[PDB]
Symmetry: D2
Subunit: 358 residues, 4 copies
């Protein structure tokens, strides 16, 4: 029984998510992407965008654009590895979307305009069963981070779920084992050296909400606030009010790194922490949290699908010799690639669980 | 009698133009910028943007934001070197602008939405007397390139003028001395290595009109088209249908270079062309066309206000040993800074001539 | 009978060449890289450099560093896909290299210090049979561009061959078909928008020979001279003194594009030229010269091994409507990747022909 | 009595220092730069390098290259604002420099090859009096940070002084007031997002000592270690073994930022710390420690000569709501410009004190 999904909003996020599905070879067999929705239905343009990625290169699958009817002037259907995907026109209100008419049960909300629990529900009123917001959510939506708290998903209570953010998906895993392995965490501050994103400007532009955010992105180091710190508090309750952090947008199109500085509950050492993270990466966190012993740089993590990949050498070489409480942990993450795979993982999980409970 | 001007659209272009007025020390004495119009009237945000520029640095003048009335919650008035500038709320149709009520005679149209002669004329219906479009125009608007054909401006015939484009303001000067010095020009192809601009995207985004133009700007070499070639045909009629060119957008926030390859009418040499350009730069083109004998790079032309600055070394060293017809000329230009000064020079010219003819 | 090859100089060029060999799955079976020579014999460092590449990503083969004798402190042997490569200490004079002692017949001279025919011959005096300079040569060394004039290679006369440069390998193929298909070429000027290289500096630095070439590389458009223009005159005699060109180094780590402007001998059209290049690419130039009908950017050519891939849309869209003589041709090239594959192709060709003639 | 100074090593650092002098308008009157030493004496090249800077732009003073004798083929004398500066030939051993013969008392060691106390003393053996190493020093040399411990300079005991590093000159000031204002500092970890430098590579290159540091600089986030953390322990004794930090080299040619995370001794608040830093910046730290309330970005600090400029907004907005011990402090610094001005200030301080004690 292929999971009927729909993607509302086919921008960087949307496409990435779709590509992640196709990349995992789930298209057709496991997941059926009935359709994608956006301000345009020009399938030829979508194929172009999918076939060529500045950062992620060429896809391992075949993409072609065709016409639903030999009547239509411009393609409106996408064909990935044979499977057919419908390019549907966008709506101002999610409830106006023909989800029920199309047979879509799970809608991936990635337009960034419906991050509010109430507004997102519109998809269900449109005929959808479940909605997964590919970004932080507001309005009391269940936030989940694969590898940290997916077990808290309630098929009967949760209908609008949030996959949090890319940064949160990198920090939470670390914080998760730090607390689970009973290392404790009195308080902590994290800084993320983050690659610039679509919301930024090429040259100095307009940004009334975020003044710094409007400055030339690939020529500046741009400070910015982030909720990934507090958000982890929702996935890991015990950390509420103990964690906070900021971001530094820098001249890279993709891949970011987390720098966590925290104080432990009981005396320990950087070595202990090191081994515990590695051990977790090889056991209950495999696939989500990984690690490296190599002298790597951002470029080396492109297309790495782990939500968080711990940098052992960087960590061990930059802590106090015999410190027992104050530590710094460094973990990388492909802010685009990994997050996308997590959205897929979240959907498959929910679907598998929604079916199990019947 | 200070020229009463109004800037419609206060983005990069609008500000740069305004900064060029201030930088030239014309604010107040020579030019009276009665007001600027944008979707926002937040003078504090405008002050911020003017006081800090990634590429051009800090201004040589003082900029402060004040309140028209102590009642207003957020500053709506800009104070540059004592002169007061009004921050007015934008309108959908230029004709609704209170130009006449503000006493504005010359309007600088730089929103990018009224490049059409018919739409731009709305400012005049709004009360303005003359309009200068800070970009290429359509609908039969007189196009002028200072130092090439300002003498063709007709106070009684032209009311909506276009200052052309940055690139055109770089090529025209060259082509102008090439034809004036009777070198001739059978045909010519020009390629411009241009810095990326506001219309581009930080990361792969949406660009239906220009597909390549949607790719990550600071990380790719992006081919694009340019009308600068044909436009020079309107400023210099003799070149109609003889010129054409293309552009390559590269990873630089500012400063571009023009690579002109053309075939001369009569036998000559690159040394001849070289001496001529330098001669013209020192005489009838001074201030508009300049040149350099130094081993410079793009950064070296930041804040250079000449529309086009000829590169002697680069030219002399890259032509055929004894060629007599087929040549290549290289000239730099600060695509932001110079163009901005030109808009100011055009306004001052129009104003002086409008007044002279009474 | 595995070709015995030795790499002198294991820098960007040398490694790329090596990776090209391994990538083509030639390591061991077809080509035996007996050893690589450099200022360091630290195999662990070389492994690191080969296992991680900022631009080309991770290798498809396995690389491991081991010790020749359990005695040595630091590994001095590289093991790729099982094959053992010796890491040998560099020498001031190539004649001091143990080529004969190692059984090396073909030496890849890529240190950039022995581009002179006389100095390169030192390898032969050292025991080697043939020398391939992975760069433009001087001193009368035979220059060869695969796909254009490899047939002119003489196993008895040519012992020190030059693969030319990346730029020459992109332009020659084009020029080759232009002349072969009898399009003619009175004169021609080419400009290459080239990615920065190892010879450049991160921040303004020292470069007595090339003043401009010493300025911050990733933040400037840096003009420079190129011999790729004249060099094509040696591979395609008929073009001697007819071609010339220049380069513009821009802020990209890899991939460049050639902008060729030329005047044909007989009347023709850009469409004729377009179809001809596409035909040549699909026939006698397949593998060397390719083409594209897509709206691509530099990043799309990363890892493309064709010496030159013609841009059809960019070319057709930027030429004069009904021009018959003056044209512009656009072709891209992964200046690093493709050139490397050519070096390997040159070597295999030579080796096959040296054996045949006996 | 003009301070007789000599610059050994005229690279980025050297020039910067020399330009700092001229910029301050000290050249000639206060400081007499008798000469500069480097592998080359080509004054014309030096003038070029000084008249054009990718990051800092054009100089406010005039630079010209002349010949000591109308005999010499290439200029060997620099003429800034009239003052004459000799361009001397470099030596392998500092003791072989004609410092005594030239009348140079204070030598600025900025070659990076003589950071060792013992080797640097060679300048004094060459006839010099005092030596200032424009970089961290080893061998037990007195390290001083203007605004933090210049008073600890002993004219009779210290003959080889170290101005520390750019990063240390940024963190020290902050830590200084943190301790002086009795906020206390149990332990502290600092991360510095640093622009790339001359030691890095444009494309993946050779770097045996620092493997990651060899990777393409302007296209990666590169982790690295830094002694700036421990170094503050020598300038501020009470901080020994309490501080430690790391660095992240990002794609920016200049300007860096410090992210300090520390635990205080007694209960306090971020607001307290904020007001304290500002107070200190207006009083005893003026000229060394500055601050901003604006939404700035890296580019906004170019040409800022303060050793450290505290970011109040960034700081206040990214700490825990009611935290009393665990805090984060952010401060920018033009790693090139500021440090250079400090070197000059150190020299003027030492000279004024050397003379005072007689
Ligand atoms: C690729 O094709 C194009 C072409 C285009 O230009 C016309 C814009 C976009 C674009 O913005 N594309 C957006 C971008 O790629 C991504 C947001 O991160 O999702 C897209 N997007 C934005 N709004 C969307 C929507 N409903 C909202 C909506 C629908 C109808 C009217 C509205 C009026 C006011 C405010 C909202 C309105 N439904 C689906 N995708 C959306 C995409
Ligand atoms: C700096 O402050 C802000 C804040 C903001 O968001 C709230 C948007 C902008 C912005 O877009 N800023 C634009 C940008 O800075 C610059 C274009 O290069 O001009 C601005 N701009 C956009 N439209 C403008 C206009 N009339 C058009 C117009 C007026 C009224 C309603 C309209 C409805 C639909 C379509 C057009 C409408 N008049 C003047 N400046 C304008 C600037
Ligand atoms: C990773 O290993 C390292 C370490 C290093 O630092 C010490 C430098 C390099 C490096 O420059 N590496 C260079 C770089 O990778 C590449 C040139 O693009 O070739 C390397 N290279 C430079 N000279 C070489 C040589 N013989 C010349 C030579 C050898 C011995 C003495 C000489 C004295 C004077 C003049 C020439 C001398 N043989 C092999 N590779 C060479 C490589
Ligand atoms: C423009 O002028 C040029 C030209 C050049 O190439 C020809 C190299 C440089 C350059 O490297 N320039 C170096 C660079 O700009 C900076 C160090 O970061 O200082 C320069 N530098 C390096 N060594 C120097 C020295 N004595 C040391 C020395 C002197 C003589 C021989 C030595 C042999 C082995 C080891 C050390 C040797 N004295 C002054 N400046 C120096 C500068």
């Amino acid at each position: 029984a292929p999971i009927k999904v729909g993607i509302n909003g086919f921008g960087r996020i949307g496409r990435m998510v779709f590509q992640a599905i196709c990349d995992q070879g789930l298209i057709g067999t496991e997941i059926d992407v009935v359709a994608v929705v956006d301000m345009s239905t020009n399938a030829e343009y979508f194929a172009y965008q999918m076939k060529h990625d500045t950062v992620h290169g060429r896809p391992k699958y075949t993409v072609e654009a065709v016409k639903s009817s030999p009547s239509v002037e411009t393609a409106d259907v996408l064909v990935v590895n044979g499977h057919r995907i419908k390019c549907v026109k966008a709506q101002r209100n999610p409830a106006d979307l023909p989800w029920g008419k199309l047979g879509v049960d799970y809608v991936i909300e990635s337009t960034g305009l419906f991050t509010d629990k109430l507004k997102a529900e519109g998809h269900i009123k449109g005929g959808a069963k479940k909605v997964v917001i590919s970004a932080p959510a507001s309005g009391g939506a269940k936030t989940i981070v694969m590898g940290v708290n997916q077990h808290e998903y309630s098929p009967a209570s949760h209908h609008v779920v949030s996959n949090a953010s890319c940064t949160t998906n990198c920090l939470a895993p670390i914080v998760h084992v730090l607390t689970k392995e009973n290392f404790g965490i009195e308080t902590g501050l994290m800084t993320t050296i983050h690659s610039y994103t679509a919301t930024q400007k090429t040259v100095d532009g307009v940004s009334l909400k975020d003044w710094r955010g409007g400055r030339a992105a690939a020529v500046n180091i741009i400070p910015s606030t982030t909720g990934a710190a507090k958000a982890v508090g929702m996935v890991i309750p015990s950390t509420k009010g103990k964690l906070t952090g900021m971001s530094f947008r820098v001249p890279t199109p993709d891949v970011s790194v987390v720098d966590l500085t925290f104080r432990a509950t009981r005396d320990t050492s950087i070595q202990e922490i090191d081994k515990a993270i590695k051990k977790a990466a090889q056991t209950y966190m495999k696939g989500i949290l990984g690690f490296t012993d190599e002298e790597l740089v951002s470029a080396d993590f492109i297309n790495d699908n782990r939500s968080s990949v711990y940098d052992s050498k960087a960590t061990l070489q930059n802590n106090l010799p015999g410190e027992k409480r104050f530590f710094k942990v460094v973990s990388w993450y492909d802010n685009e690639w990994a997050y996308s795979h997590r959205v897929v993982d979240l959907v498959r999980y929910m679907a598998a669980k929604d079916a199990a409970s019947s």
